[PDB]
From Swiss-Prot:
Gene: CPL1
Record annotation: effect of changing residue 93 to A/Q: Almost complete loss of activity
EC numbers, comma separated: 3.2.1.17
Catalytic activity annotation: Hydrolysis of (1->4)-beta-linkages between N-acetylmuramic acid and N-acetyl-D-glucosamine residues in a peptidoglycan and between N-acetyl-D-glucosamine residues in chitodextrins
Residue positions of the active site: 9, 91, 93
Molecular function GO labels: lysozyme activity
UniProt cross-references to PROSITE patterns, sorted A to Z: CW, GLYCOSYL_HYDROL_F25_1, GLYCOSYL_HYDROL_F25_2
Domain notes: The C-terminal domain comprising the repeats is involved in choline binding.
Name under which the protein is recorded: Lysozyme
SMART domains linked to this entry: Glyco_25 (SM00641)
EC class of the enzyme, as a word: hydrolase
Cell wall-binding repeats, residue ranges: 199-218, 219-238, 240-259, 260-279, 280-299, 302-321
Length: 338
């Protein structure tokens, strides 16, 4: 998954049919409850797996601050993982001990075991609980960017940035349980592999071209090099800081030539491209601020509305704000948080 992707998390509380909530949510990404303690298994596991595309599974912790117990709970969990996925989650939100350090050590042990098994460990919880019962800084010390934090705000079923939990290392955000658990991804999955580069970059007085291994070079095409997409013009130079329309869609090649993904600053204006590099039009929220973006006839427009109090204010060409809010009721657009 990548920044701003969504996923649902379920347990027996969701039943043997989760096709409905996956449709409402508009994704098949799930994290499914496998187990709890050393003796309980979610009986809906196989149906839920079957109806979705899991990116992880989770375990509901009951070990408190007892390390030996955490070990046994991890093994029971691991022994019941039905398929390989990137992540396995430690759901730590109940039965903490009085000793906050014992709690931390037991969490670290659970997590260390998931790693040793060849998965990425995640610590899941909510802020006030985490603050009272562990040293999360010690978790992040061993497992950077491994947190999945819950913080619902008004819990009205949408992601509302005002209530974003502030903690270091948050990878994913459970932003609501109304009417089922909803999550948004804050960080791209890690890709700790040496990128390829099937050739060598050359710079001449006109620009950058790519000499492939075989001596030829890309021209009039997209080509992925070192994991990154570039577009090369008819003369073999990669485009830089330029718009490109390809098959009806709009792409933006950054100053280093890489196809923009996500929010990208073009001069002084913000544009949002999806995971594929294709510009998204209409209303898109960027944390607290709203942008209405269009590209009719190749005329690229980014209407920015800056938040202030309960209102949002249009920003003119001269970077000037109106005295009064342009709107107080948010449009129903795409919410991004990064």
């Amino acid at each position: 998954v990548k920044k701003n992707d969504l996923f649902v998390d379920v347990s027996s509380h969701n039943g043997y049919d989760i096709t409905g909530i996956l449709e409402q949510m508009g994704t098949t990404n799930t994290i499914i409850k496998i187990s709890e303690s050393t003796t309980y298994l979610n009986p809906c596991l196989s149906a839920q797996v079957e109806q979705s595309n899991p990116i992880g599974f989770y375990h509901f912790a009951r070990f408190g601050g007892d390390v030996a117990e955490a070990e046994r709970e991890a093994q029971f969990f691991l022994d019941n993982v039905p398929m390989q996925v990137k992540y396995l989650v430690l759901d730590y939100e109940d039965d903490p001990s009085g000793d906050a350090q014992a709690n931390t050590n037991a969490c670290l042990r659970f997590m260390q075991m998931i790693a040793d098994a060849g998965y990425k460990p995640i610590y899941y919880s909510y802020k006030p609980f985490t603050h009272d019962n562990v040293d999360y800084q010690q978790i992040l010390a061993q497992f950077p960017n491994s947190l999945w934090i819950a913080g619902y705000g008004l819990n009205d079923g949408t992601a509302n940035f005002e209530y974003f939990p502030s903690m270091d290392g948050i990878r994913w955000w459970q932003y609501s349980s109304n009417p089922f658990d909803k999550n948004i991804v804050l960080l791209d999955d890690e890709e700790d592999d040496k990128p390829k580069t099937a050739g060598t970059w050359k710079q001449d007085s006109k620009g950058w071209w790519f000499r492939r291994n075989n001596g030829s070079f890309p021209y009039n095409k997209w080509e992925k090099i070192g994991g990154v997409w570039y577009y090369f013009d008819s003369k073999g130079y990669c485009l830089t800081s330029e718009w490109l329309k390809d098959n009806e869609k709009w792409y933006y090649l950054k100053d280093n030539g890489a196809m923009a993904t996500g929010w990208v600053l073009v001069g002084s204006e913000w544009y949002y491209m999806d995971d594929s590099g294709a510009m998204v039009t209409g209303w898109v929220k960027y944390k607290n601020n709203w942008y209405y973006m269009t590209n009719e006839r190749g005329n690229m427009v980014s209407n920015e509305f800056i938040k202030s109090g309960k209102g949002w204010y249009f920003m003119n060409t001269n970077g000037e704000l109106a005295d009064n809010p342009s709107f107080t009721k948010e449009p129903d657009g795409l919410i991004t948080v990064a």
